[PDB]
Symmetry: D2
Subunit: 337 residues, 4 copies
């Protein structure tokens, strides 16, 4: 008997989560949907031949007792509300990033979840499910390189839109690195600093691209993260961890090699959407399996969402002050360990 899932927000990402739950994964189905654009939701239900109730809003959908879990995939600033509602409604919630657009909004969600007494919230930081990052994790966990000391990483995007603005590099783009890194090395951030190199000809005048973000943890690990969203050549994620006795590095995505016209080459992905498809599948399949096999969620926690939110705020501060900002976290409530 399948997990019955209500989706709040039926845009490009909600539609993709609906397609995988419906045609790829196992153990769940979509029974309810709601969208700010109620017409758009109706089209979705028809597009994917769903057996779903179309509601006017999220309270209606959460009111429906036949639904046991929700996917929060609405406009970013809209997330905090639905998450809060679903928690008090005591449903299982998978929330796409961000958990909330402010550190406060995350704190409210943390405080609420601690009441309900168990893990209901899983945040959509999918990198933790990528086979590469999983391997890095296993290696560190087995002490293969001794104590981590430094981390170098890059998040490169071929080109962004006119809409894309300087702060979005940290709040949208760097946010994945921010979650996965502290998860990898089991350490909390302490300071951040932003350094702007010469502008790139490919960046529009209103955008500061590229950027370099330096982040120290409490234990003293030093991270320097390169963000270049108009790098032109492709979509590219790189991550090298330098330990005491060795170095481990994230793999390139699999590609056939080619010998032709003077070059020995492999492919580089252009579309960000193809880089992590496997991690999304595994991320959602786990949300399901975990509930039906543990009566709770297992992925990135509400607390992690808070950490992301705080560190993000610090980065945006550093962005505009050119200073070394501090990352001040509240104590980790034992509820999350």
């Amino acid at each position: 008997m399948s997990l019955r899932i209500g989706v709040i927000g039926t845009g490009a990402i909600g539609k993709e989560h609906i397609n995988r739950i419906t045609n790829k994964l196992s153990g769940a189905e979509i029974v309810a949907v709601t969208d700010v654009n109620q017409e758009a939701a109706q089209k979705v239900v028809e597009q994917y031949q769903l057996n779903a109730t179309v509601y006017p809003n999220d309270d209606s959908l959460l009111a429906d007792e036949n639904v046991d879990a929700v996917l929060v995939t609405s406009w970013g600033p809209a997330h905090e509300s639905s998450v809060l509602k679903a928690i008090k409604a005591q449903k299982y919630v998978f929330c796409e990033k961000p958990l909330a657009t402010t550190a406060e909004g995350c704190m409210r969600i943390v405080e609420e979840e601690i009441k309900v007494g168990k893990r209901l919230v899983q945040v959509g930081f999918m990198r933790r499910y990528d086979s590469g990052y999983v391997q890095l994790k296993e290696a560190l966990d087995n002490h293969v390189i001794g104590e981590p000391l430094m981390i170098h990483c890059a998040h490169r995007n071929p080109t962004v839109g006119d809409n894309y603005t300087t702060d979005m590099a940290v709040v949208d783009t760097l946010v994945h690195e921010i979650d996965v890194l502290h998860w990898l090395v089991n350490d909390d951030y302490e300071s951040v600093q932003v350094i702007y190199p010469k502008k790139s000809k490919n960046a529009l005048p209103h955008l500061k691209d590229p950027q370099i973000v330096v982040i120290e943890t409490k234990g003293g690990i030093v991270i320097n993260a390169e963000i270049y969203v108009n790098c032109k050549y492709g979509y590219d994620i790189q991550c090298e961890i330098v330990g005491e006795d060795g170095i481990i590095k994230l793999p390139e995505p699999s590609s056939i090699s080619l010998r032709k016209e003077g070059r020995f080459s492999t492919d580089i992905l252009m579309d960000w959407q193809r880089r992590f498809v496997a991690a999304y599948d595994v991320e959602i399949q786990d949300f399901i399996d975990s509930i039906q096999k543990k009566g709770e969620v297992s992925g990135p926690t509400a607390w992690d969402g808070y950490i992301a939110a705080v560190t993000t705020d610090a980065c945006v501060k550093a962005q505009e002050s050119g200073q070394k900002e501090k990352v001040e976290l509240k104590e980790k409530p034992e509820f999350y360990q």
Copy 2:
């Protein structure tokens, strides 16, 4: 409404196909099972909490009208029977290799399928679904390297069992290369020759390991395939296609790199079972989707099974004669194109 699947043979592989259909894939369920060891099948149904009828044999299971598709995963020599039955019973059949242990047994299945008037048989040559081989396919299809001229490939296994015998290298091991290569280059085999290098210390006295198999197609492509099932270092699949204007090569499985104690390294898989897990998932998911979206199967055909069987026979001949044997194929019935 899901495809309802009966499984004939509930051993190690049937159990794996049952686990994926039940807990990973989408659009199907197991409703019937049968096994030579009827007790073993009962245990399976309990192990995976299935809603399935346990039958005494395959005619009983095929007689059941509520089942619409079968997985033939029994002892190798047992396949030909169930496949024939399921065809006359007009059910959809996914048959694990071999389709039949003789070229004749394949011909019977081909002749039978052509009667029933549509594609019911899909053979379990999963390599066609591997993302690497798919990329090689796309490149050749796009004429990236011009006409293929030669192919070098290797199928290496760490170590085999006491049970493993010389002929098994071609009938079991090389059989995957035999299917995928002719699929890649759209050409039929014409001759085969086996050359035995110095024996390996890791091979038991009764086994001829390693082996080299040279195969020419009709168009003149020359294949030389290395088989070394006691290579010790790992499980390894390599494939290089040399064209007129360039060279394309199969990727290593993804791994993190390590810098430690004088070496810069990546991992090599030890267990063959981890090499193709993604292709099995995609292979079966396609068997399903195709039926429910086309009213027929789409993968490797009964004819391909025949080709595999014929080429295999030729290789075993060459094995013992040290001669250049001929691969004599009957004309490809238009039913398969």
Copy 3:
């Protein structure tokens, strides 16, 4: 017509330069060695069956009207003196790093040379002669990746002795990076910040290891250099240059690949001596050839030695400071461009 050469300081590197000039290169011979240890110099004269003269001091060696050029290869502090004399005595001089231990000492040498009217002083920054770096320079000169924006480099070393001190990391180690980088990107530095990650267990109590050095050029290029001299795994030099439209990267030293015991690996050098052996040969040969053909030296200028001296000064300052120290440079004299 062999160029007659005298060596001031038959030390470790002095011995090697003597051996390559004597037994590998073309068009020159050692005719005079002087060492602060008269007996050391004598051992070397018999070591390489040299037909040379042993002098108590440089004055007398330089007085020898035979010597056309000198190799200044003794203690770092003892360089400025020998160099200045050599210029006044108007001999050709190849000086191993550093040119002088003080930014001013180098400016003193800069002036003397300008007077003499031609270039007599070449500094031993051999990296400029490495095929790798030469390839990098070629690609940059050809606009292959457009404008350089960022550079990520690392200089790692298995272990050091009790004598290796925190500042030696920027004085003796990072010095090569500081030279080659500005040569490559054709830009002047401006600021250096030093960031100390968690100290490694492989470092001795008195040493700060690892260290990160961020460096901004006046054009806007940001450079972060990792120095880790107790990395344990091997001796390793990495350099990646991120441009507007692409990325170029320094190769690993050629090594055979090996597949064995679950790993696919290349070799990492364990000894800094082996890393640039070819660069030395090409270096000295150019000294010789340049003189015999043009009547002057060619390599890194005395000015580059000064550029080094200054930059490495700001780094030693940022080591204690913790702040963004400044790099003020005198304007480049007409003499050098």
Copy 4:
């Protein structure tokens, strides 16, 4: 005390050997050149401002009591003669491949040398001086992968001229492989089979290209070598050795990596001249050094030239035959081990 050297045949390669000895290496000079074209030789004497004598023929050049050694670097057929004279005249001889164009001509040279009592003849198979192959030899000598069982190698070239003929593929091209392989694995050949794949569109009507050459040693090692001289993409040499417990492989030539326009790539050389330039320098230097230190030459022996001559004979035979031709070799004389 420079070794005085005379060059017989100031051709393309003769010019290069003259240039490296004159301007790169140590301990030798060119004092006499003779060419079948008196005016060609004269151009070269002024070309490299040589202080040499121009002789109408080799007899007169060898008569010159100045020359201590000769470089035999003229038309292939014109080698045996010049070599034999040189031995009778008791000079040191470095002979570029081939030693002689007939297996017997080489056996003639073998005998003459044995008489003289020491080794005067070194053959120009420079691959033995390549760091890559040297690394391979080292690993094999150390038993890193246990017993060699198979070797896969390829010799590819962008394009050839109208003059390049089918047999030149084994005479001029595969010849280097034939030498270095037996050196590496310390084994004698035994049989050669030639297999002609589908002919490439880049080959001229009169040429058989590509070709595959299978070769068995008397120890049981199987070697398949691909020769493709119209591969278009570049000049490329590959060599992989499969042992009992591991695999070792020849590196690509060092190149910088580039990420640009959806591709991650290294450079493939376009000109065979650039591939082994270092091997030549090390080759000639060893000729010189070996003589000045030991009073004899060191490299590939006259016997290896004969081993080549024979093997390449069986290959030219298998080219027309189509059968498994035989390689009978005279027993190795005491003189060579």
